[model samples]
Target: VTITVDEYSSNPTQAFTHYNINQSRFQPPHVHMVDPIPYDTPKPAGHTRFVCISDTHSRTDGIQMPYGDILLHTGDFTELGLPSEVKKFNDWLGNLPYEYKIVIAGNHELTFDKEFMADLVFPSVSKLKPEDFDNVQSLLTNSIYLQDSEVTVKGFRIYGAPWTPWFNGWGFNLPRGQSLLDKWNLIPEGTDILMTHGPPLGFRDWVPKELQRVGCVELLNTVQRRVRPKLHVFGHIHEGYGTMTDGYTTYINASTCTVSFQPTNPPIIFDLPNP
Candidate 1:
């Protein structure tokens, strides 16, 4: 059954409000969150509803997804990414009624990152055998799995990359500086939707619990200066779940799960007014 969710309160946190109001940080095309668009609302003619979520962590059994033309999962579908878990995730995707499902990997997808598996997980994670989850990404036959890749869905150029700064040793961990900048540079010039495992710095990337921001600085420069896509969606920082825009581009941290690992956060939906 498709899950129905009540929309979040229209009010954003005071930090978010104050940040948006700062003129020095953002110039045109008039950066700020647009007025709220509640879920299940009718879309205009020739438009497409894009339902986006992230960080399910193999807890989809309780998720009730809203209807949309296309579903975008920004990664972290499993806890430690067992082969069975990936198969289970794929099965769940197959049941979804959306016309298209686009997904990317996150740092938690241990098997997908071979280097991490060989270097860190093998020693740390008990009873981990590389062969157990070998080629696990292949199990996702039901959706498009993108890693530094692109797919044109219904004429929208979408690019998905899974990379975030190294933190406490996880998959897809890159150094904070040029290492991640190299990944951000790979994003093409005409991308309509940018999907990453994490946010692009200073936008929906704050962690109140830690009183610090933990987003990719290089990614911010790339998005704001180079690839100004119509929308950018991510979900690594679970606590930073919400949507914001720079008038030219809308940023949504569509994390299905929250900091406490509860699958209570509703999927973030966006409607593209297509001709």
Candidate 2:
């Protein structure tokens, strides 16, 4: 479960080339569809209010449930992104009263083997666990888990990327420099809200010893240069639980649960009604 980071494969065939037959055959089921919610034709600003929380890490009960038209979970819902964990988190997410609940993946969503990662590098979504299907029920079931995806509601363009720079080989990361640049370009231009699981370097808080800030410097540079999204939400480093602001983007590191499962402060709510 605990292994130091190494050069992971760049694609599935490359990764599975050396692995066993069974390992090569395993494929984790993940959702990749992008369905834009319809709103009134002449959509007005401030039409959708989003309640944001990130890095639950399996503590679904900790949220205070603030009022919002939509709910945004920036990922790490489970400790290890296990099948049961995904189901519980999915059920919890589906039951919320919000019109739309948007979810994404995080580093701990290591649901796939490295071989799978070497392919498209999306969230390692699992099939619905029996306990999950047994307990919670909803028509708005498991609304949306955005893995390198986007959702436009009313007029808000909410884009999500679950990737971070290569970490200690859990899952969902890209190596820095050109590889990161390529990965970031996949984000749609003019996205109003950017939901990435990891922070852009130096924008928010970080652990001290990891040498670098443990976020993607390339991502930070990319956001600043290309999109300049009004709100960029993220969480991964448990200690970096707060908010910061660049020139155009307001960065919210909304890690809702503390390392000990306390409320961990509160969501950094914002309002951006255009002039």
TM-score of each: 0.87, 0.71
TM-score of 2: 0.71
Q: Which has the greatest TM-score?
A: 1
Off by over 4 Å in 2: 1-47, 112-140, 209-212, 259-263
Which tens-of-lDDT digit does each residue in 95-120 have in candidate 2?
67888888887777665223333342
Q: Candidate 1: which stretches are off by over 4 Å?
A: 1-23, 26-29, 120-126
lDDT of 1 by residue, 1-275 (tens): 11111121111233234445764454345656655467768888788899999999999996888878999999999887778889999999999999999999998888888887777524435476667767798999999999999999888999999898888678898877667777887899889999999987667788888776777766776787778898999999999888888767899999889999999988877999763
Each model's backbone clash number: 2, 1
In model 1, how large is the Cα lDDT of residue 247? 66
